[PDB]
Amino acid sequence: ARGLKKHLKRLNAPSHWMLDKLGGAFAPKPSSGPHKARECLPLILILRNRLKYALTYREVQSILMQRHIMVDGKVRTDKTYPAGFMDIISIPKTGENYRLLYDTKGRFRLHSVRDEDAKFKLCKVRSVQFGQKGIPYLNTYDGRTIRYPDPLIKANDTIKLDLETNKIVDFIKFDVGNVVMVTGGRNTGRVGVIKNREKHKGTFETIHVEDAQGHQFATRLGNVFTIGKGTKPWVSLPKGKGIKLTIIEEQRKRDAAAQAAAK
Amino acid sequence: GKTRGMGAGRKLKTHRRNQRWADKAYKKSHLGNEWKKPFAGSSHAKGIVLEKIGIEAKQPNSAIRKCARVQLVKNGKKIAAFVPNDGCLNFIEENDEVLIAGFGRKGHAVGDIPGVRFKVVKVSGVSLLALFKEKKEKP
Amino acid sequence: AEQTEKAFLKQPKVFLCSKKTTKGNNKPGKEGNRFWKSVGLGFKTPKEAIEGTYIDKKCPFTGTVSIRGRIIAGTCHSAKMNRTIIVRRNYLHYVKKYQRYEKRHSNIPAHISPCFRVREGDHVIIGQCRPLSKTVRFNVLKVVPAGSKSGA
RNA sequence: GAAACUGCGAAUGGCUCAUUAAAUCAGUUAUAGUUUGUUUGAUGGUACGUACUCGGAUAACCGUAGUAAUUCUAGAGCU
RNA sequence: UAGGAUAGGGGCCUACCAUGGUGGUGACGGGUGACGGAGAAUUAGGGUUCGAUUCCGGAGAGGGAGCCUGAGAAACGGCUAC
RNA sequence: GGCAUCGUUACUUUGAAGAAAUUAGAGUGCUCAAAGCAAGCCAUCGCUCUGGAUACAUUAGCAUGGGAUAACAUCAUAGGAU
RNA sequence: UCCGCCGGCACCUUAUGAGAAAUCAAAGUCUUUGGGUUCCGGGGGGAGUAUGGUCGCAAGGCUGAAACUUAAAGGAAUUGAC
RNA sequence: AGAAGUCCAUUGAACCUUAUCAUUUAGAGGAAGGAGAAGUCGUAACAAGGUUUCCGUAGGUGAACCUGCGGAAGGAUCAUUG
Ligand SMILES: [K+]
Numbered sequence: 024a025r026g027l028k029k030h031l032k033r034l035n036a037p038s039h040w041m042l043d044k045l046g047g048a049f050a051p052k053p054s055s056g057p058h059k060a061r062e063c064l065p066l067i068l069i070l071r072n073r074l075k076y077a078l079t080y081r082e083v084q085s086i087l088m089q090r091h092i093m094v095d096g097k098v099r100t101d102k103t104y105p106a107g108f109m110d111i112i113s114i115p116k117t118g119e120n121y122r123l124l125y126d127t128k129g130r131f132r133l134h135s136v137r138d139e140d141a142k143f144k145l146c147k148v149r150s151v152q153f154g155q156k157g158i159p160y161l162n163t164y165d166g167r168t169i170r171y172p173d174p175l176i177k178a179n180d181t182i183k184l185d186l187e188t189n190k191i192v193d194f195i196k197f198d199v200g201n202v203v204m205v206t207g208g209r210n211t212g213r214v215g216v217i218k219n220r221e222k223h224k225g226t227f228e229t230i231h232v233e234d235a236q237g238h239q240f241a242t243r244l245g246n247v248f249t250i251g252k253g254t255k256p257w258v259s260l261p262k263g264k265g266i267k268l269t270i271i272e273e274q275r276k277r278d279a280a281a282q283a284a285a286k
Numbered sequence: 287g288k289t290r291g292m293g294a295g296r297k298l299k300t301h302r303r304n305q306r307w308a309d310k311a312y313k314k315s316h317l318g319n320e321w322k323k324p325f326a327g328s329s330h331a332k333g334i335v336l337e338k339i340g341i342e343a344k345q346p347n348s349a350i351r352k353c354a355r356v357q358l359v360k361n362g363k364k365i366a367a368f369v370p371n372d373g374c375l376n377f378i379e380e381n382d383e384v385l386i387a388g389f390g391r392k393g394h395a396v397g398d399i400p401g402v403r404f405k406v407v408k409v410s411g412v413s414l415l416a417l418f419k420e421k422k423e424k425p
Numbered sequence: 426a427e428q429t430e431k432a433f434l435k436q437p438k439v440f441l442c443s444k445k446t447t448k449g450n451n452k453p454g455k456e457g458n459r460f461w462k463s464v465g466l467g468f469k470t471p472k473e474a475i476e477g478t479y480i481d482k483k484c485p486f487t488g489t490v491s492i493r494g495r496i497i498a499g500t501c502h503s504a505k506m507n508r509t510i511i512v513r514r515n516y517l518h519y520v521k522k523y524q525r526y527e528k529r530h531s532n533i534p535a536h537i538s539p540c541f542r543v544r545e546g547d548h549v550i551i552g553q554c555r556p557l558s559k560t561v562r563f564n565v566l567k568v569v570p571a572g573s574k575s576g577a
Numbered sequence: 578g579a580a581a582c583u584g585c586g587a588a589u590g591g592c593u594c595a596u597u598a599a600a601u602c603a604g605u606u607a608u609a610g611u612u613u614g615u616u617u618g619a620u621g622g623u624a625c626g627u628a629c630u631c632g633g634a635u636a637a638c639c640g641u642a643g644u645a646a647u648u649c650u651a652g653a654g655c656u
Numbered sequence: 657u658a659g660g661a662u663a664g665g666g667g668c669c670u671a672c673c674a675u676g677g678u679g680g681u682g683a684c685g686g687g688u689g690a691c692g693g694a695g696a697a698u699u700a701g702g703g704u705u706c707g708a709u710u711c712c713g714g715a716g717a718g719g720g721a722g723c724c725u726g727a728g729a730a731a732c733g734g735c736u737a738c
Numbered sequence: 739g740g741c742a743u744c745g746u747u748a749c750u751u752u753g754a755a756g757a758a759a760u761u762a763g764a765g766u767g768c769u770c771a772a773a774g775c776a777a778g779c780c781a782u783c784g785c786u787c788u789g790g791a792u793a794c795a796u797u798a799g800c801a802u803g804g805g806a807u808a809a810c811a812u813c814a815u816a817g818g819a820u
Numbered sequence: 821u822c823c824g825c826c827g828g829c830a831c832c833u834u835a836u837g838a839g840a841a842a843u844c845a846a847a848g849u850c851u852u853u854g855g856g857u858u859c860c861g862g863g864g865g866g867a868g869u870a871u872g873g874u875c876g877c878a879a880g881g882c883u884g885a886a887a888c889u890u891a892a893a894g895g896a897a898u899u900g901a902c
Numbered sequence: 903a904g905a906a907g908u909c910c911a912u913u914g915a916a917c918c919u920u921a922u923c924a925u926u927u928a929g930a931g932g933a934a935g936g937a938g939a940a941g942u943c944g945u946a947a948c949a950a951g952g953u954u955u956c957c958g959u960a961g962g963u964g965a966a967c968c969u970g971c972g973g974a975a976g977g978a979u980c981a982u983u984g
């Protein structure tokens with residue numbers, strides 16, 4: 024009340040952190056970092072609860088202190104560091120370069136990308152204005168800021184950003200006909216192609232997207248993330264990429280029963 | 287009869303709000319007088335046996351009900367409490383410690399006893415039922 | 426003139442003593458000029474605000490106040506004030522148990538610039554701004570006189 | 578490596594519901610009306626009018642104590 | 657209207673000016689054995705009653721008031737006064 | 739990709755944003771159950787990318803389509819439209 | 821004197837209607853429940869009493885409780901008794 | 903550089919009178935309801951209740967009540983074209 028809060032109750036944790044209700048009174052509060060602490064997956068919830076590498080809040084530390092975790096091309100030790108979207112969690116030694124992608128149910132998935140594809144990432148772009156001494160800068164959506172950007176780059180764009188030599192390799196503008204993945208709300212994790220953008224003077228830029236399998240859905244100007252030019256994404260999607268409503272999930276379970284086992 | 291306009295929600299709500307007061311139970315509960323009763327909105331109470339009395343049962347009955355005049359310790363009010371289970375007036379003595387409860391009709395006289403709304407449940411920390419059935423002895 | 430107080434009233438950052446000419450200089454309010462801006466949201470700046478001599482720092486068009494937030498339409502309730510009116514916002518509250526509507530209202534104090542002529546019962550459109558007084562949080566953006574919208 | 582100086586924390590957590598009836602609060606807004614240790618990214622040319630690195634203290638320590646008394650308190654000598 | 661103060665808007669405060677502001681669509685005032693919400697009980701439907709308590713927000717450290725340090729407190733397992 | 743400038747609402751449809759927990763509800767033989775979000779399998783130096791679904795959530799607010807039923811003023815000094 | 825129309829005070833017969841029934845052509849068109857609107861009742865007493873407010877010269881009028889007490893009070897019709 | 907002290911302004915606890923609001927209670931005396939198997943005095947109402955009954959109002963007397971004026975049938979008359 025008189026200041027900041029350093030505790031996060033388990034029942035107050037974000038939903039995509041599927042945490043057992045009777046597992047404790049507290050959840051790991053995400054540290055300050057590049058991502059918004061509600062759309063992030065802390066490292067504690069990576070070496071635990073997603074991989075069986077660590078078993079407690081004592082071996083996550085025991086393997087972070089060995090400097091074994093390299094997120095976004097940099098060794099990180101803070102166990103509650105907020106890896107939030109498409110961050111390259113590159114585990115050295117064993118080589119587990121993982122892109123944090125959005126499951127069709129709003130979850131977080133560690134898509135195992137190849138090593139040479141793990142040397143870059145992509146970032147969404149916030150406003151672009153003039154800095155001190157009249158030097159334009161980028162100010163992406165994951166805390167990153169890049170000075171001297173190419174003048175074609177504008178707001179809401181996406182940039183393919185290198186890691187070892189941090190410079191913009193190329194970029195995709197925000198326009199209709201581009202692959203887009205939704206990263207917020209109920210439509211999280213659904214890829215599609217923008218059909219038209221509707222503009223309301225004052226607020227609420229609404230984007231209408233067409234799914235590959237024929238479905239259509241709308242969302243805000245936020246929560247969307249351009250992925251690739253035209254209809255070809257620049258990254259490997261985890262699987263499915265379609266909403267897959269409950270009935271067809273039941274059908275998949277049925278055919279899994281009727282095949283494979285089939286007995 | 288009734289106001290059936292779609293724009294007449296306030297009239298219906300206000301009319302029902304006014305007319306709830308004719309209800310006996312609603313007026314009993316929402317007038318706040320239940321706090322001025324001896325129990326002051328409590329299920330049981332505790333008291334000191336001031337004296338042992340008998341009241342003649344109302345007509346057409348004919349008997350002597352062994353009550354007890356007691357004084358509550360929480361507010362000092364003096365009330366008469368019935369003593370059931372024949373022979374249980376002997377267990378009660380003077381200036382004794384008793385636990386009193388309501389009689390059953392929620393602030394109304396029960397049976398032929400004139401103006402008695404309480405019954406003795408415990409005496410000296412022992413239930414009248416246990417003493418009556420010889421399960422326990424008065425300390 | 427517009428100077429009716431014990432201090433000179435001027436538009437901030439508008440130099441009124443430049444020797445070089447004007448009437449052709451962009452951003453009105455340069456080299457000596459009335460400063461005015463479009464509030465956006467599809468609202469037209471009145472001619473009485475561009476070609477005006479009044480000074481009002483709380484005016485949305487020629488002042489330091491920007492319109493953002495909520496836009497509310499209503500009717501003028503009382504205009505007995507100095508550049509401030511009361512707007513009555515009538516609506517219907519849904520009594521759920523009886524599934525019926527009851528008429529409700531709410532007074533909203535708004536600041537009206539000297540470019541808008543108003544009368545009691547006029548139809549006003551106002552927009553939320555930063556607090557300007559204890560109760561004023563809206564600025565009048567459009568005024569339509571009562572008994573209007575004619576022509577067929 | 579005890580003690581001590583320095584830095585940081587103790588404004589979180591825990592407990593309770595007395596005050597409070599458009600007030601708190603819920604949904605929804607705005608900061609173009611502001612502050613923000615911290616985390617992440619980026620950015621620091623003008624001092625000139627001994628720089629192969631300047632100065633005085635002080636704690637722990639040691640020894641003179643006061644008071645019935647307390648993480649009550651005063652002097653001295655080092656660093 | 658112009659200042660002062662504040663991290664900042666604002667009668668928040670000061671000087672001057674005007675007479676306004678709310679109300680049977682219940683202001684103002686009173687009662688609450690009234691913290692608000694998510695929710696609880698009972699429920700054909702509608703509903704009625706409850707919601708101190710583990711999740712969110714607010715308030716308090718016997719009762720009031722003032723304040724230092726600090727990025728953050730009018731803090732009480734901090735100080736000052738009654 | 740155009741390009742306008744427009745009676746306002748109620749109503750209704752579709753969408754979005756919407757804390758968890760609780761409720762409804764899919765899967766799952768904790769020996770059953772109330773529960774929990776686990777687990778299951780060849781009999782592996784492992785696999786199922788294992789799962790950790792989905793609704794509702796008044797009213798108020800934002801956006802899309804509909805104009806039947808309703809409420810406002812607009813209706814002949816032409817100060818009308820082209 | 822005869823016929824017809826509108827408006828009014830009533831009356832007679834009959835439910836296929838309603839109602840606890842007396843009875844009602846409206847007291848009908850009501851579990852097959854919704855044309856609009858005003859007032860007003862919630863078992864019998866205490867009681868149209870106490871007190872406050874207010875009008876009146878007064879007598880009084882309008883508004884109007886509570887504690888407590890009670891298992892019935894009451895409506896229509898039936899058979900006896902008187 | 904700087905302590906004690908001092909001056910003005912400001913926030914302002916706390917105490918001391920008056921007034922006022924809210925809550926509980928004592929009180930000589932009056933007086934009202936209710937209950938009680940003890941009663942005294944009459945018979946006001948129910949039959950034409952032995953003066954038909956009842957409303958408003960005014961007066962009167964031991965008590966039910968009586969009487970004056972206007973009204974009603976809830977009357978003991980649905981009726982005299984004689
Ligand atoms: K601190």
Ligand SMILES: [K+]
Pocket residue numbers: none
């Ligand atoms: K709110």
Ligand SMILES: [K+]
Pocket residue numbers: 662664665
């Ligand atoms: K301010």
Ligand SMILES: [K+]
Pocket residue numbers: 726
């Ligand atoms: K600090």
Ligand SMILES: [Mg+2]
Pocket residue numbers: 225226
């Ligand atoms: Mg905005």
Ligand SMILES: [Mg+2]
Pocket residue numbers: none
């Ligand atoms: Mg220290």
Ligand SMILES: [Mg+2]
Pocket residue numbers: 024
């Ligand atoms: Mg706390």
Ligand SMILES: [Mg+2]
Pocket residue numbers: none
């Ligand atoms: Mg109050």
Ligand SMILES: [Mg+2]
Pocket residue numbers: 599
């Ligand atoms: Mg409000």
Ligand SMILES: [Mg+2]
Pocket residue numbers: none
């Ligand atoms: Mg000011």
Ligand SMILES: [Mg+2]
Pocket residue numbers: none
């Ligand atoms: Mg003043």
Ligand SMILES: [Mg+2]
Pocket residue numbers: 690
């Ligand atoms: Mg309280």
Ligand SMILES: [Mg+2]
Pocket residue numbers: none
């Ligand atoms: Mg609560």
Ligand SMILES: [Mg+2]
Pocket residue numbers: 709
């Ligand atoms: Mg507790």
Ligand SMILES: [Mg+2]
Pocket residue numbers: none
């Ligand atoms: Mg709390």
Ligand SMILES: [Mg+2]
Pocket residue numbers: none
């Ligand atoms: Mg506090």
Ligand SMILES: [Mg+2]
Pocket residue numbers: 718
């Ligand atoms: Mg205490």
